[PDB]
Amino acid sequence: MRCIGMSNRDFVEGVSGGSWVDIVLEHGSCVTTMAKNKPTLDFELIKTEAKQPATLRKYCIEAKLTNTTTESRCPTQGEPSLNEEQDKRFVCKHSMVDRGWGNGCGLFGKGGIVTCAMFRCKKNMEGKVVQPENLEYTIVITPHSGEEHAGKHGKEIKITPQSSITEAELTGYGTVTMECSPRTLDFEMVLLQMENKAWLVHRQWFLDLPLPWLPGADTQGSNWIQKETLVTFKNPHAKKQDVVVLGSQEGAMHTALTGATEIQMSSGNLLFTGHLKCRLRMDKLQLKGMSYSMCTGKFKVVKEIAETQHGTIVIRVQYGDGSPCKIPFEIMDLEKRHVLGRLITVNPIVTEKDSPVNIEAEPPFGDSYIIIGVEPGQLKLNWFKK
Numbered sequence: 277m278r279c280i281g282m283s284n285r286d287f288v289e290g291v292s293g294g295s296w297v298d299i300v301l302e303h304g305s306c307v308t309t310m311a312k313n314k315p316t317l318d319f320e321l322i323k324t325e326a327k328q329p330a331t332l333r334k335y336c337i338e339a340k341l342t343n344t345t346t347e348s349r350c351p352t353q354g355e356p357s358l359n360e361e362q363d364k365r366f367v368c369k370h371s372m373v374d375r376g377w378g379n380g381c382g383l384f385g386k387g388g389i390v391t392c393a394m395f396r397c398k399k400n401m402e403g404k405v406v407q408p409e410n411l412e413y414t415i416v417i418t419p420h421s422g423e424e425h426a427g428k429h430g431k432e433i434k435i436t437p438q439s440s441i442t443e444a445e446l447t448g449y450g451t452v453t454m455e456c457s458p459r460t461l462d463f464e465m466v467l468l469q470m471e472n473k474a475w476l477v478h479r480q481w482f483l484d485l486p487l488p489w490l491p492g493a494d495t496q497g498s499n500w501i502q503k504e505t506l507v508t509f510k511n512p513h514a515k516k517q518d519v520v521v522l523g524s525q526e527g528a529m530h531t532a533l534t535g536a537t538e539i540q541m542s543s544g545n546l547l548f549t550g551h552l553k554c555r556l557r558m559d560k561l562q563l564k565g566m567s568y569s570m571c572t573g574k575f576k577v578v579k580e581i582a583e584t585q586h587g588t589i590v591i592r593v594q595y596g597d598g599s600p601c602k603i604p605f606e607i608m609d610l611e612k613r614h615v616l617g618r619l620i621t622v623n624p625i626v627t628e629k630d631s632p633v634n635i636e637a638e639p640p641f642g643d644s645y646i647i648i649g650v651e652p653g654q655l656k657l658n659w660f661k662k
Contacts, residue, residue: 278306278318278418279318279418279420280584280586280588280636282304282306282585284302284304284305284306285305285307285585285586286300286305286307286308287310287586288307288308288309289309290309290311290558294557295557296555296556297309297311297557297558298553298555299553299554299556300552300554301320301415301456301552301553301554302552303321306318306320307320308420308620309556310620311558313562313563314558314563315420315446315561315563315622315623316621317417317418317419317446317452317561318416318417318419318420318430319416319417319418320415321415321552322414322416323414323547324414324547325412325545325547325548326404326410326411326412326467326546327410327412328410329404329405329406329410329546330404330405331402331403331404331493332402332403332466332492333402333403333483333491333492334401334490334492334497335400335401335403335487335488336397336399336487336488336489336490336503336506337400337524337529338398338506338524339395339396339397339503339507340398341393341394341395341521342396344392344518345358345393346389346391346512346517347389347390348375348387348388348515349388350380350382350387351375351381351385351386352383353387353388354388355370355388355390356389358390360394361392363394365394365396365499366392366393366394366395367392367519368390368391368392368393369390369391369504369509370388370389370390371388371389371390371512371517372389373387373512373513373514374514375514379514379515380514380515389512389514389517391509391512393507395488395500395503395506397488397497399471401529403466403467403468403477403482404467404469404546405463405467406465406467406546407463408437408458409436410436411437411458411548412434412436413434413456413550413552414432414433414434415433415434415435415456416429416432417433417444417446417452418430418431419564420621420636421564421621421624422590422624422633422635422636423627423634424632431444431445431446437456437457437458441455442454443560446561448564449561449562449563450560450561450562451560452556452557452558452560452561453557454554454556454557455555455556456553456554456555457552458552459551459552459553461548464479464480465477465479466478466479466482468482468533469541470529470530470533471526472541473541474540475536475538476537487502487505487525488500488502488503489501506521506522506525507519507520508521563623565602565623566623568599568602569599569601569602570601570604570650571595571597571599571601571602571603571604571649572597572651573595573596573597573598573649573650573652574595574649574653575593575595575596575603575648576593576594577591577593577657578592581659584636587638588620588639589659590636591634591635591657592633592634593633593635594626594629594631594632594633595626596629600625600626600627601626602623603633603635603648604647604649604650605635605637605647607637607644607647607659608645609644609645610643616644617639618637618638619635619636619637620638621634621636621637639659639661641661641662642660642661644658644660644661645657645658
Protein backbone atom coordinates (compact mmCIF):
# COMPACT_ATOMS: atom_id res chain seq x y z
CA MET A 277 0.00 0.00 0.00
CA ARG A 278 2.81 2.41 0.81
CA CYS A 279 3.94 2.50 -2.82
CA ILE A 280 0.39 2.73 -4.15
CA GLY A 281 -0.16 5.81 -2.02
CA MET A 282 2.90 7.51 -3.41
CA SER A 283 2.64 10.05 -6.20
CA ASN A 284 6.13 9.29 -7.47
CA ARG A 285 5.92 5.68 -8.58
CA ASP A 286 7.76 4.06 -11.52
CA PHE A 287 6.68 0.81 -13.19
CA VAL A 288 9.58 -1.21 -14.54
CA GLU A 289 9.62 -4.54 -16.37
CA GLY A 290 12.35 -6.66 -17.93
CA VAL A 291 12.26 -7.03 -21.72
CA SER A 292 14.19 -10.29 -21.40
CA GLY A 293 14.32 -13.33 -19.12
CA GLY A 294 16.94 -13.85 -16.45
CA SER A 295 18.27 -10.47 -17.55
CA TRP A 296 19.10 -7.48 -15.37
CA VAL A 297 16.53 -4.71 -14.99
CA ASP A 298 17.59 -1.16 -14.20
CA ILE A 299 15.75 1.11 -11.79
CA VAL A 300 16.39 4.52 -10.26
CA LEU A 301 15.78 4.99 -6.53
CA GLU A 302 14.99 8.38 -4.98
CA HIS A 303 13.88 9.54 -1.51
CA GLY A 304 10.11 9.89 -1.42
CA SER A 305 9.53 7.71 -4.47
CA CYS A 306 9.13 4.01 -5.10
CA VAL A 307 9.59 1.63 -7.98
CA THR A 308 7.37 -1.34 -8.76
CA THR A 309 8.90 -4.16 -10.78
CA MET A 310 7.06 -6.87 -12.65
CA ALA A 311 7.97 -9.96 -14.66
CA LYS A 312 6.23 -12.98 -16.14
CA ASN A 313 5.65 -15.62 -13.44
CA LYS A 314 7.48 -13.56 -10.84
CA PRO A 315 6.03 -11.62 -7.94
CA THR A 316 5.71 -7.89 -8.26
CA LEU A 317 8.06 -6.04 -5.92
CA ASP A 318 8.22 -2.53 -4.45
CA PHE A 319 11.52 -0.72 -3.90
CA GLU A 320 12.13 2.36 -1.78
CA LEU A 321 15.28 4.16 -0.66
CA ILE A 322 14.39 5.32 2.87
CA LYS A 323 17.69 6.30 4.48
CA THR A 324 21.07 7.70 3.44
CA GLU A 325 23.53 8.32 6.26
CA ALA A 326 27.25 8.68 6.83
CA LYS A 327 28.58 6.41 9.57
CA GLN A 328 31.53 7.57 11.66
CA PRO A 329 33.00 10.08 9.15
CA ALA A 330 36.52 11.39 9.78
CA THR A 331 36.70 14.28 12.27
CA LEU A 332 38.71 17.12 10.77
CA ARG A 333 38.97 19.70 13.55
CA LYS A 334 37.45 20.42 16.95
CA TYR A 335 36.76 24.09 17.66
CA CYS A 336 36.32 25.41 21.16
CA ILE A 337 33.46 27.96 21.33
CA GLU A 338 33.34 28.61 25.07
CA ALA A 339 36.03 28.44 27.72
CA LYS A 340 37.04 29.33 31.24
CA LEU A 341 40.34 30.46 32.77
CA THR A 342 41.90 29.43 36.06
CA ASN A 343 45.23 29.82 37.90
CA THR A 344 46.34 33.02 36.22
CA THR A 345 50.00 33.64 37.08
CA THR A 346 52.30 36.58 36.45
CA GLU A 347 56.08 36.96 36.46
CA SER A 348 58.17 40.00 35.54
CA ARG A 349 61.78 41.20 35.55
CA CYS A 350 63.49 44.58 35.90
CA PRO A 351 64.93 46.55 33.00
CA THR A 352 68.24 44.93 31.97
CA GLN A 353 67.60 41.40 33.23
CA GLY A 354 66.18 39.65 30.17
CA GLU A 355 62.85 37.92 29.48
CA PRO A 356 61.13 36.31 32.48
CA SER A 357 59.63 32.85 32.23
CA LEU A 358 57.17 30.49 33.84
CA ASN A 359 57.42 26.71 33.56
CA GLU A 360 53.68 26.47 32.89
CA GLU A 361 54.65 28.25 29.68
CA GLN A 362 55.61 24.69 28.66
CA ASP A 363 52.27 23.19 29.72
CA LYS A 364 50.05 22.99 26.63
CA ARG A 365 46.91 23.63 28.71
CA PHE A 366 47.91 27.27 29.35
CA VAL A 367 47.60 30.42 27.27
CA CYS A 368 50.45 32.86 27.79
CA LYS A 369 51.65 36.21 26.51
CA HIS A 370 54.94 38.07 26.72
CA SER A 371 54.96 41.85 27.09
CA MET A 372 56.95 44.81 28.40
CA VAL A 373 55.84 47.05 31.25
CA ASP A 374 57.30 50.11 32.97
CA ARG A 375 59.29 49.30 36.11
CA GLY A 376 61.24 51.34 38.67
CA TRP A 377 61.95 52.13 42.32
CA GLY A 378 58.26 52.04 43.13
CA ASN A 379 58.04 48.34 42.35
CA GLY A 380 61.35 46.79 43.30
CA CYS A 381 63.72 47.75 40.50
CA GLY A 382 66.99 49.64 40.60
CA LEU A 383 66.48 51.30 37.21
CA PHE A 384 63.48 52.98 35.65
CA GLY A 385 62.67 51.52 32.25
CA LYS A 386 60.76 48.78 30.47
CA GLY A 387 60.88 45.31 31.96
CA GLY A 388 59.84 41.90 30.72
CA ILE A 389 56.58 40.44 32.00
CA VAL A 390 54.79 37.17 31.26
CA THR A 391 51.33 35.91 32.22
CA CYS A 392 49.71 32.50 31.88
CA ALA A 393 46.27 31.13 32.64
CA MET A 394 45.01 27.57 32.40
CA PHE A 395 42.58 27.33 29.49
CA ARG A 396 39.59 25.01 29.97
CA CYS A 397 37.19 24.48 27.07
CA LYS A 398 33.56 24.14 28.21
CA LYS A 399 31.74 23.77 24.89
CA ASN A 400 33.12 22.89 21.47
CA MET A 401 31.92 22.05 17.99
CA GLU A 402 33.43 19.69 15.43
CA GLY A 403 33.47 19.59 11.66
CA LYS A 404 33.55 16.25 9.89
CA VAL A 405 34.46 15.09 6.41
CA VAL A 406 31.98 12.78 4.70
CA GLN A 407 33.50 10.34 2.20
CA PRO A 408 31.27 9.24 -0.71
CA GLU A 409 32.21 5.70 0.24
CA ASN A 410 31.25 4.58 3.74
CA LEU A 411 27.89 6.24 3.04
CA GLU A 412 25.14 3.77 3.84
CA TYR A 413 21.87 3.56 1.93
CA THR A 414 18.85 1.74 3.37
CA ILE A 415 16.49 0.13 0.87
CA VAL A 416 13.23 -1.65 1.57
CA ILE A 417 12.06 -4.36 -0.80
CA THR A 418 8.36 -5.08 -0.24
CA PRO A 419 6.43 -7.92 -1.92
CA HIS A 420 3.37 -6.50 -3.75
CA SER A 421 0.89 -9.07 -2.47
CA GLY A 422 -1.92 -7.03 -0.98
CA GLU A 423 -1.90 -9.10 2.23
CA GLU A 424 -3.11 -7.31 5.37
CA HIS A 425 -1.88 -5.82 8.62
CA ALA A 426 -3.33 -2.47 10.13
CA GLY A 427 4.79 -8.65 10.96
CA LYS A 428 4.81 -8.24 7.19
CA HIS A 429 7.66 -5.77 6.69
CA GLY A 430 9.51 -5.70 3.40
CA LYS A 431 13.11 -6.88 3.62
CA GLU A 432 15.37 -4.05 4.71
CA ILE A 433 18.94 -4.06 3.38
CA LYS A 434 21.84 -1.66 3.95
CA ILE A 435 24.57 -1.24 1.40
CA THR A 436 27.69 0.83 0.70
CA PRO A 437 29.21 1.89 -2.61
CA GLN A 438 31.96 -0.53 -1.57
CA SER A 439 29.79 -3.52 -0.66
CA SER A 440 29.34 -6.34 -3.18
CA ILE A 441 26.20 -7.49 -4.98
CA THR A 442 23.41 -8.13 -2.51
CA GLU A 443 21.28 -11.26 -2.33
CA ALA A 444 18.14 -10.36 -0.40
CA GLU A 445 15.81 -13.03 0.87
CA LEU A 446 12.08 -12.42 0.71
CA THR A 447 10.30 -14.88 3.00
CA GLY A 448 8.18 -17.05 0.77
CA TYR A 449 9.40 -15.93 -2.65
CA GLY A 450 13.12 -16.66 -2.74
CA THR A 451 15.85 -14.06 -3.11
CA VAL A 452 16.36 -11.03 -5.29
CA THR A 453 19.83 -9.97 -6.34
CA MET A 454 20.78 -6.34 -6.81
CA GLU A 455 23.72 -3.94 -7.00
CA CYS A 456 23.71 -0.18 -6.63
CA SER A 457 25.81 2.85 -7.47
CA PRO A 458 25.61 6.24 -5.70
CA ARG A 459 25.38 7.66 -9.20
CA THR A 460 25.56 11.44 -8.82
CA LEU A 461 26.24 14.60 -3.93
CA ASP A 462 29.52 16.44 -3.20
CA PHE A 463 32.02 16.02 -0.35
CA GLU A 464 35.54 19.92 -0.84
CA MET A 465 32.94 20.55 1.86
CA VAL A 466 32.61 19.97 5.60
CA LEU A 467 29.85 19.13 8.05
CA LEU A 468 29.74 21.32 11.15
CA GLN A 469 28.20 19.93 14.34
CA MET A 470 27.02 22.32 17.06
CA GLU A 471 25.49 20.10 19.72
CA ASN A 472 23.36 17.61 17.77
CA LYS A 473 22.50 20.17 15.09
CA ALA A 474 24.59 20.14 11.91
CA TRP A 475 25.27 22.18 8.77
CA LEU A 476 27.14 21.66 5.50
CA VAL A 477 29.86 24.29 5.13
CA HIS A 478 32.63 24.97 2.62
CA ARG A 479 36.19 24.12 3.56
CA GLN A 480 38.84 26.84 3.98
CA TRP A 481 36.08 28.72 5.80
CA PHE A 482 35.86 26.09 8.49
CA LEU A 483 39.67 25.99 8.54
CA ASP A 484 39.87 29.78 8.80
CA LEU A 485 37.53 30.13 11.78
CA PRO A 486 39.23 32.26 14.47
CA LEU A 487 38.68 29.90 17.38
CA PRO A 488 40.85 27.56 19.44
CA TRP A 489 41.05 24.11 17.83
CA LEU A 490 42.56 20.65 18.01
CA PRO A 491 43.54 18.21 15.25
CA GLY A 492 40.70 15.77 14.60
CA ALA A 493 42.47 12.67 15.95
CA ASP A 494 42.63 14.01 19.52
CA THR A 495 41.12 12.74 22.76
CA GLN A 496 42.95 14.81 25.36
CA GLY A 497 40.84 17.85 24.55
CA SER A 498 43.34 19.99 26.44
CA ASN A 499 46.17 21.17 24.15
CA TRP A 500 44.18 23.76 22.20
CA ILE A 501 45.75 25.71 19.34
CA GLN A 502 45.45 29.51 19.15
CA LYS A 503 43.71 29.98 22.49
CA GLU A 504 44.38 33.72 22.24
CA THR A 505 41.35 33.83 19.96
CA LEU A 506 39.13 33.51 23.07
CA VAL A 507 41.50 35.27 25.43
CA THR A 508 42.33 38.89 26.00
CA PHE A 509 45.31 40.13 27.95
CA LYS A 510 44.71 43.57 29.50
CA ASN A 511 47.54 46.10 29.64
CA PRO A 512 50.04 44.80 32.19
CA HIS A 513 51.15 46.36 35.46
CA ALA A 514 54.56 46.16 37.10
CA LYS A 515 53.85 42.80 38.78
CA LYS A 516 50.38 41.63 37.71
CA GLN A 517 48.24 41.48 34.62
CA ASP A 518 44.61 40.56 34.14
CA VAL A 519 43.40 38.04 31.60
CA VAL A 520 39.75 37.66 30.58
CA VAL A 521 38.10 35.20 28.25
CA LEU A 522 35.48 36.11 25.65
CA GLY A 523 31.97 34.85 26.23
CA SER A 524 30.41 31.85 24.48
CA GLN A 525 30.45 32.02 20.69
CA GLU A 526 27.62 29.54 20.13
CA GLY A 527 25.40 32.53 19.35
CA ALA A 528 27.89 34.34 17.13
CA MET A 529 28.16 31.02 15.32
CA HIS A 530 24.43 30.27 14.96
CA THR A 531 23.46 33.64 13.53
CA ALA A 532 26.56 33.22 11.33
CA LEU A 533 25.53 29.90 9.77
CA THR A 534 22.12 31.17 8.65
CA GLY A 535 22.06 30.54 4.91
CA ALA A 536 24.16 27.36 4.69
CA THR A 537 22.22 24.15 4.01
CA GLU A 538 21.14 22.61 7.31
CA ILE A 539 21.75 18.88 7.66
CA GLN A 540 19.47 16.59 9.65
CA MET A 541 20.96 13.92 11.90
CA SER A 542 20.35 11.41 14.67
CA SER A 543 22.30 9.01 16.88
CA GLY A 544 25.34 11.09 16.00
CA ASN A 545 25.01 10.14 12.34
CA LEU A 546 24.42 12.66 9.56
CA LEU A 547 21.55 12.07 7.14
CA PHE A 548 21.26 13.05 3.50
CA THR A 549 18.82 12.60 0.67
CA GLY A 550 20.68 10.15 -1.56
CA HIS A 551 20.26 9.11 -5.19
CA LEU A 552 20.79 5.54 -6.38
CA LYS A 553 20.94 3.60 -9.65
CA CYS A 554 20.57 -0.14 -9.25
CA ARG A 555 20.25 -3.28 -11.32
CA LEU A 556 18.40 -6.34 -10.12
CA ARG A 557 17.88 -9.93 -11.24
CA MET A 558 14.81 -12.05 -10.41
CA ASP A 559 15.92 -15.49 -11.60
CA LYS A 560 15.85 -16.66 -7.97
CA LEU A 561 12.37 -15.32 -7.19
CA GLN A 562 9.20 -17.32 -7.60
CA LEU A 563 5.50 -16.95 -6.84
CA LYS A 564 4.45 -17.71 -3.26
CA GLY A 565 1.54 -20.12 -3.36
CA MET A 566 1.76 -21.86 -6.71
CA SER A 567 0.18 -25.32 -6.57
CA TYR A 568 -2.91 -24.51 -4.54
CA SER A 569 -6.56 -24.89 -5.45
CA MET A 570 -8.59 -22.33 -7.43
CA CYS A 571 -10.94 -20.87 -4.79
CA THR A 572 -14.35 -22.29 -5.47
CA GLY A 573 -16.58 -19.98 -3.42
CA LYS A 574 -17.67 -16.39 -2.61
CA PHE A 575 -16.36 -12.90 -2.03
CA LYS A 576 -17.99 -9.76 -0.74
CA VAL A 577 -16.26 -6.56 -1.80
CA VAL A 578 -15.24 -5.31 1.65
CA LYS A 579 -15.78 -1.66 0.68
CA GLU A 580 -15.74 0.94 -2.10
CA ILE A 581 -13.40 0.04 -4.96
CA ALA A 582 -10.59 2.58 -5.00
CA GLU A 583 -8.84 4.43 -7.82
CA THR A 584 -5.12 5.02 -7.42
CA GLN A 585 -2.99 7.82 -8.80
CA HIS A 586 -1.61 5.36 -11.35
CA GLY A 587 -4.41 4.23 -13.63
CA THR A 588 -5.04 1.26 -11.39
CA ILE A 589 -7.61 0.04 -8.90
CA VAL A 590 -7.50 -1.62 -5.49
CA ILE A 591 -10.30 -4.12 -4.85
CA ARG A 592 -10.76 -5.42 -1.29
CA VAL A 593 -12.43 -8.85 -1.12
CA GLN A 594 -12.82 -11.58 1.46
CA TYR A 595 -13.86 -15.20 1.05
CA GLY A 596 -16.42 -18.13 1.58
CA ASP A 597 -16.26 -21.84 0.42
CA GLY A 598 -12.64 -22.92 0.63
CA SER A 599 -9.03 -23.50 1.50
CA PRO A 600 -6.56 -20.62 1.87
CA CYS A 601 -6.73 -20.36 -1.95
CA LYS A 602 -5.84 -18.74 -5.26
CA ILE A 603 -8.51 -16.34 -6.44
CA PRO A 604 -9.84 -16.21 -9.89
CA PHE A 605 -9.27 -12.68 -11.09
CA GLU A 606 -9.80 -11.64 -14.65
CA ILE A 607 -10.61 -8.38 -16.39
CA MET A 608 -12.46 -8.83 -19.67
CA ASP A 609 -14.52 -6.79 -22.10
CA LEU A 610 -18.27 -6.13 -21.75
CA GLU A 611 -18.88 -9.32 -23.70
CA LYS A 612 -16.56 -11.43 -21.56
CA ARG A 613 -14.87 -12.63 -24.78
CA HIS A 614 -11.24 -11.53 -24.48
CA VAL A 615 -8.93 -10.71 -21.56
CA LEU A 616 -8.04 -7.06 -21.06
CA GLY A 617 -5.90 -5.20 -18.53
CA ARG A 618 -3.61 -6.98 -16.05
CA LEU A 619 -2.85 -7.58 -12.40
CA ILE A 620 -0.17 -5.70 -10.46
CA THR A 621 -0.94 -8.01 -7.53
CA VAL A 622 -0.04 -11.40 -8.93
CA ASN A 623 -1.28 -14.85 -7.89
CA PRO A 624 -3.62 -13.11 -5.44
CA ILE A 625 -4.54 -15.48 -2.65
CA VAL A 626 -6.61 -15.78 0.52
CA THR A 627 -4.88 -16.71 3.79
CA GLU A 628 -7.88 -16.60 6.12
CA LYS A 629 -11.66 -16.69 6.19
CA ASP A 630 -12.62 -13.05 6.73
CA SER A 631 -9.24 -11.55 5.85
CA PRO A 632 -9.62 -8.56 3.50
CA VAL A 633 -7.37 -9.36 0.55
CA ASN A 634 -6.55 -6.12 -1.22
CA ILE A 635 -5.84 -6.51 -4.94
CA GLU A 636 -4.33 -3.88 -7.22
CA ALA A 637 -5.14 -4.25 -10.89
CA GLU A 638 -4.90 -2.25 -14.07
CA PRO A 639 -8.21 -2.08 -16.01
CA PRO A 640 -8.01 -1.21 -19.70
CA PHE A 641 -9.18 2.24 -20.72
CA GLY A 642 -12.93 2.50 -21.13
CA ASP A 643 -15.32 -0.31 -20.16
CA SER A 644 -14.45 -3.68 -18.65
CA TYR A 645 -15.84 -6.43 -16.42
CA ILE A 646 -13.98 -7.30 -13.25
CA ILE A 647 -14.65 -11.01 -12.79
CA ILE A 648 -13.75 -12.17 -9.28
CA GLY A 649 -14.48 -15.77 -8.35
CA VAL A 650 -16.29 -18.79 -9.75
CA GLU A 651 -19.68 -20.26 -10.75
CA PRO A 652 -22.07 -19.80 -7.81
CA GLY A 653 -21.60 -16.05 -8.00
CA GLN A 654 -18.71 -15.12 -10.37
CA LEU A 655 -18.57 -11.41 -9.40
CA LYS A 656 -19.19 -9.24 -12.47
CA LEU A 657 -18.23 -5.68 -11.49
CA ASN A 658 -18.52 -3.05 -14.23
CA TRP A 659 -15.71 -0.53 -14.49
CA PHE A 660 -15.00 2.56 -16.54
CA LYS A 661 -11.50 3.99 -16.69
CA LYS A 662 -11.31 7.65 -17.74
